[PDB]
Amino acid sequence: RRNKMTAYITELSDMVPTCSALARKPDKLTILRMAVSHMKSLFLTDQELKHLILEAADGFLFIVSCETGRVVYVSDSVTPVLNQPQSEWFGSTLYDQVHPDDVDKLREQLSTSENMGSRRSFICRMRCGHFVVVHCTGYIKAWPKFCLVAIGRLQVPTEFISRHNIEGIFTFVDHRCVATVGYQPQELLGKNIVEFCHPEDQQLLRDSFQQVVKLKGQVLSVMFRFRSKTREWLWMRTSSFTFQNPYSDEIEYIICTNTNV
């Protein structure tokens, strides 16, 4: 157990080039005095923690007035997060730097009616370069009237997708179907997919639907002729698989990617 304190001192010496600048470790008491000089020589530094936070979360700090939203201060990390000079931010109001439909959440959070040192945590869309989603956490400090001090961090047609009940009725269609089959989504939803299938190919697709269910979780790809809105049989590669609830495993829907072949 004495190793711990010994490794500690060899580790300490191994952390400084002026402790590798001797033939050997000085007296253990002398080693403690030797390091005290180095530690005092030079991690509370503002500039270090700002970069730690930009490293970790890709976020910047800013202070705006609660009454007007004017940015009394913005740190220089706004340029790497949002590609916006402090020129644009400083001497402006956060309202003109966020999405028009977010100014309301913005005033709500900027309110001082009920909450001073109160916390704040919201999400908004800030203009860049287009808007980016920004998580904002902060508090409210006296202006010297009121001011939000806050951190904002950044964070991460050939076919059409459909969802079906096991019967085969479209319960979901994405907007791309108008360019692949010509139907408006509402013309497909509520109807069965076999309705738009050429009668010759109808048993093929009908068989795939049972198979995908028995072949639970797994993809199979049937190929049939699809009736367009413009009425022309279009070959269609439908790759389907089962989706099931991650708790009860009850089948939630069949998911199909209809690709014109």
Partner: protein, 291 residues
């Protein structure tokens, strides 16, 4: 004498007296941190860490928490001095360890995950001892860096997920709560959903949340549910909920597993849902429900 063991100026009414390994571990850790900070870099040291809703952690490839921000206490109870220089694995849930190990390795450097860490603070805001160690889920987002036999570091920001029962943070008009069963079916939802997404709560009760997910999102949303059940809390990614009469709204959700405290059993999943957008593509009909 050993008065130099009362005399190390470590970054001062706490640099004076420290016990056993506290003086040394802190010092070695500080110098290693400075070594990394040189690699990254190129007054207001109190605003930055009082705005954060989490703490900053620099953890090496071995697993050493060579740097922990001063605020870890407000969220974890355990002090920066109790933990700096100690191994991440001695204060995290063991069944999370392997995940932490693959997030410490090496080539995208971005990291986003959820860990469970020991916590000796309590809901009221009063601290407790280490035998009284609860598990708190932290959303960890950061970068792994190579720095100098090159070393390797994980600079993460670790945020707690507010418990739906207890929260002193302003609730927005764009945030609404929903309760769900383990079958992901709504068992309750807020009155505001109608004003924001257009649906009355009555017509969602009994409907699984998979009915309303935009088809492009629902698998990324199962993975988030499979991590909320494994770990008890989660933050979702941005997702689309189909609106009542065409369209979709953007949402982010903090999920929490709620335990019946009499039988110690999973009763429901409470979800705090954040509306990020207005109805988008209301002209477009996606679902049979919205017709």
């Amino acid at each position: 004498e050993t008065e130099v063991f009362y005399e190390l100026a470590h970054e001062h009414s706490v640099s004076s007296h420290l016990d056993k390994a506290s003086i040394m571990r802190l010092a070695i850790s500080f110098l290693r941190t400075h070594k990394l900070l040189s690699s990254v870099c190129s007054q207001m040291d109190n605003l930055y860490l009082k705005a954060l809703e989490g703490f900053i952690a620099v953890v090496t490839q071995d697993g050493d928490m060579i740097f922990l921000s001063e605020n870890i206490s407000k969220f974890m109870g355990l002090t920066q001095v109790e933990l700096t220089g100690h191994s991440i694995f001695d204060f995290t849930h063991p069944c999370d360890h392997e995940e932490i190990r693959e997030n410490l390795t090496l080539v995208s450097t971005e990291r986003d995950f959820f860990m469970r860490m020991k916590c000796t603070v309590t809901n009221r805001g009063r601290t407790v001892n280490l035998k009284s160690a609860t598990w708190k889920v932290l959303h960890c987002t950061g970068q792994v860096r190579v720095y100098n036999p090159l070393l390797s570091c994980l600079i993460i920001m670790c945020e707690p997920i507010q418990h739906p029962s207890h929260m002193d943070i302003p609730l927005d008009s764009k945030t609404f709560l929903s309760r769900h069963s383990m079958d992901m079916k709504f068992t309750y939802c807020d009155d505001r959903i109608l004003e924001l997404i257009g649906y009355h709560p009555e017509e969602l009760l009994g409907r699984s949340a998979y009915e309303f997910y935009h088809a492009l999102d629902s698998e990324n949303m199962t993975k988030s549910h499979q991590n909320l059940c494994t770990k008890g809390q989660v933050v979702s990614g941005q997702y689309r909920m189909l609106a009542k009469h065409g369209g979709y709204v953007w949402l982010e959700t903090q999920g929490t597993v709620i335990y019946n405290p009499r039988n110690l059993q999973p009763q429901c999943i409470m979800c705090v849902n954040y509306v990020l957008s207005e109805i988008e593509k209301n002209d477009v009909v996606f679902s049979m429900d919205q017709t």
